[PDB]
């Protein structure tokens, strides 16, 4: 049996992120005396520096946070659309669809900073300066990039390379940096510095907020100071479902997390349980999946909830998910993103971060549930999962991917419920995906192994099957679990640059 | 596909077979120590988290390069007891040295003595701070991995009869499963004693007395004098030039020179640093066997101044680690007990198993590697280092017994061509053809269908066996220097290793 790398184990805690530097920063915080929540903030901030090719200060964040008493917070750090945009705004320009990049794509407020404010005030114990120190140092000093990071820049050049604010930072010499080259981010360091000095909220109400708005002048961006000031993350409880002695939790809407819950209930109605889903018939897995994805079409801003064209391309959506758990049951399941890679490509002058293009997921069809409206939140691909067994923490997981996050989560979940002692083996397993947005019908099914190619081709009808190499095309997931003796185990996806780090 | 990303740093990187060990080295660097202080801490940590592959009762070999390009070849293999000899075994009615037991643990543990030398010549921190991570981990315990658990399971049948071993690694009478906490109180005390009296106390202080007293009644020939006279052999590494490259290996009695011989042989076939990576497999095997034939004369260096075919996989467990910094400083260190946990003999209250390295000696009087009192045996341990235009280029090595040169060579041929993705090189499927200096080549083992087909058609006269990717094909780690003096590190997916950067 081959394992990409050993699981990380600890009698106290394990940190699993898509960045070795980020995981180490979280571990150093713990070593310094902070709790896993202090560590979570340090890790999230570091990811905005070493993994901003998949997230950033200009993006959103969703999270499930569990304290030792079992209380779980569902934190929705999704920003709302500008009050200055609307369907008329686009039609007036002659557009019938929101652009994927540019000033008219960056139409929702970055919600991550606000989510940090909530986490810090409710769970942190350390000074904000100590929490953000690692991120600031790494941004100013720089770090030698990996091949995967280099590839991200190369793949982005054709779509956002025209934006000086982005190219001047990630392609300083006019070419794509090679692995090993040092990426320094002085402006980004300054943005973190300001929040360190004025607090997380200053991103929307202080000096940084003014710098952001001023730095967008001339771009045409509709984002205003008021959009930033009125932004507030949504705090609530996770949605969930029980399966035998297990309870599976997911981030609530406008996150698409509930799709996983619906899928499980569907599998359950087919006669499966926590002991048998791992070997469930593939046809039943796809049937219940599409029924769950069907209900997914109604997901949007929660305050608004009270023959579609077939997909012909691979999944669209870049993000970074990380988990941290301790022997006492505390845990975080956090995911953050700009939506498409680096984002819109628009960088507010002097801030060092790209505004997310999450708003391009909105539709201009007025009667569709997810129609663009000023101040509204859009259906969100981000989701975070958590599992309890007999009321105690069992697992904390999540995965990168746009519309495929539920599918990757489910494949991992079905195995984890059977046995959670070797999470890495589970992460290593070949996967399948069937990408399509809430506006599309199922297209081709992608698989990483000949075995899946055969099983799918024979059991799944009317579907084109495509064999692909193992890669982030099938997501990037991390996980931490709790095993006998309250020992924490962590694992990171070989599809990404992640490394799970233990701390005792 | 890459098992895990390379670890990069503008300062330094630590690559070992243990995530805890690599992290401890990082903490040392964060305290202001140099990579040599970190190397000592990492080596000690490995004696706690990887004692299924090494330990205080084993040996160590190392190549150490300072910022000035000065390279020390440190031979930390202990010599045989003065009380043993061929007559000693014949008098017992034996024609071969046993692999386990008191009569197998016949060479002095040389690792502590090697640390003494490294500490005195290269260290800057107090010994108490360097050993703190090891002591704490031994005392507090750590959850074992599946690989570690598997090591115990495989050892139970051969050394499970020894109380000193079973009481530590199988405390509940059964094999601990992954995740179970392994505490090692006695080991922690052994390390504490050295932090109080120095590394050398293992041979001439309180720990030394405890070791000898702890062997009373076992029949062990190891005496207080054997310990006191042990001293690591310090000298220069052997090497060969290939284009602008300088390839170094640990000197004899290490089998490292075998790699040097192999490279020269490949060079005689027309290959160079730019083409060896795609050399004809028949040439690779031809020169390998010629190098392995010269390997038969390797033994104690002071003694250097029709064979049966092997019928089984390689024998030899080890842990290798490397650390390099942007200034060219580097360490290529390897340590082992030889066979897994070792002889199985644990000196009462010390928490470590005596190595069974002495079982490699032959009782054939006229053989170069014949057992002699106070003599060192041919050693499977080897550490490699590479320079390019006189500057540090790579630091590498790999676990394995008689296959170490083969694993090194496959890595070396690739790294000489390109050293920017060392992890990819480590991930690549490998082949092996294990056999001791006393045997003729047997079957050839391979990790891929491709190698199977290629070997089966190009190498005639040998059985070829397909195997799953595992430590049967070694466990290697590497640190390299790329443009801008950026350090890159990688660890073998065949082991529990993780490469950790320090910035």
Automatic annotation (TrEMBL), chain B:
Q: Where are the transmembrane segments?
A: none
- The protein's superkingdom reads Archaea
PANTHER family found in the cross-reference section: GAMMA-GLUTAMYLTRANSPEPTIDASE (AFU_ORTHOLOGUE AFUA_4G13580) (PTHR43881)
Protein name per its UniProtKB record: Gamma-glutamyltransferase related protein
Q: Tell me the lineage of the source organism.
A: Archaea, Methanobacteriati, Thermoplasmatota, Thermoplasmata, Thermoplasmatales
């Amino acid at each position: 049996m081959f394992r990409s790398r050993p699981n990380a184990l600890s009698q106290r805690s394990v940190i699993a992120s898509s960045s070795e530097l980020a995981s180490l920063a979280g571990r150093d915080i713990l070593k310094r005396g902070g709790n896993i929540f202090d560590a979570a903030l340090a890790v999230s901030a570091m990811l905005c520096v070493t993994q901003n090719n998949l997230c950033g200060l200009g993006g959103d964040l969703f999270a499930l946070i569990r304290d030792e008493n079992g209380q779980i917070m569902d934190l929705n750090g999704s920003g709302q659309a500008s009050r200055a945009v609307s369907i008329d705004y686009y039609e007036s320009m002659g557009l019938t669809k929101i652009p994927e990049r540019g000033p008219y794509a960056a139409i929702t407020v970055p919600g991550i900073a606000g989510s940090w404010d909530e986490i810090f005030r409710k769970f942190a114990t350390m000074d904000i300066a100590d929490i953000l120190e690692p991120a600031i140092r790494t941004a100013s000093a720089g770090f030698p990039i990996t091949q995967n990071y280099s590839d991200s820049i190369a793949r982005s050049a054709p779509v956002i390379g025209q934006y000086r604010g982005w190219s001047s930072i990630f392609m300083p010499n006019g070419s794509v940096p090679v692995a090993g080259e040092i990426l320094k981010q002085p402006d980004l360091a300054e943005s973190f510095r300001l929040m360190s000095e004025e607090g997380f909220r200053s991103f929307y109400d202080g000096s940084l907020a003014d710098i952001i708005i001023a730095g967008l002048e001339g771009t045409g961006s509709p984002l205003s100071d008021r959009d930033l000031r009125v932004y507030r993350p949504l705090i609530g409880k996770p949605v969930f479902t029980d399966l035998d002695e297990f309870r599976i939790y997911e981030t609530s809407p406008n996150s698409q997390g509930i799709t996983v819950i619906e899928w499980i209930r569907g599998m359950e109605s087919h006669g499966y349980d926590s002991r048998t889903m791992w070997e469930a018939k593939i046809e039943d897995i796809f049937e219940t999946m599409e029924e769950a994805y069907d209900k997914r079409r109604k997901i949007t801003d929660p305050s608004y909830m009270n023959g579609l064209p077939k997909r012909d391309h691979n999944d669209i959506g870049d993000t970074t998910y990380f988990s941290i758990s301790d022997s006492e049951g505390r845990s975080v399941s956090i995911i953050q993103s700009n939506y498409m890679g680096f984002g819109s490509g628009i960088v507010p002058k002097g801030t060092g971060f790209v505004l997310q293009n999450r708003g391009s997921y909105f539709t201009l069809q007025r009667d569709h549930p997810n129609a663009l409206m000023p101040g509204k939140r859009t259906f969100h691909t981000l989701a975070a999962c958590m599992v309890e067994k007999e009321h105690d923490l069992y697992a904390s997981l999540g995965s990168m991917g746009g519309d495929i996050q539920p599918q990757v989560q489910m494949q991992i979940l079905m195995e984890i419920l059977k046995d959670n002692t070797d999470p890495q083996a589970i992460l290593d397993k070949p996967r399948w995906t069937e990408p399509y947005t809430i506006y599309e019908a199922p297209g081709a099914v992608y698989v990483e192994s000949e075995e899946l190619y055969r099983n799918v081709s024979k059991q799944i009808s009317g579907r084109k099957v495509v064999l692909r190499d193992v890669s982030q095309e099938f997501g990037t997931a991390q996980i931490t679990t709790l095993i006998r003796g309250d020992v924490v185990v962590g694992a990171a996806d070989p599809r990404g640059d992640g490394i799970a780090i233990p701390y005792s």
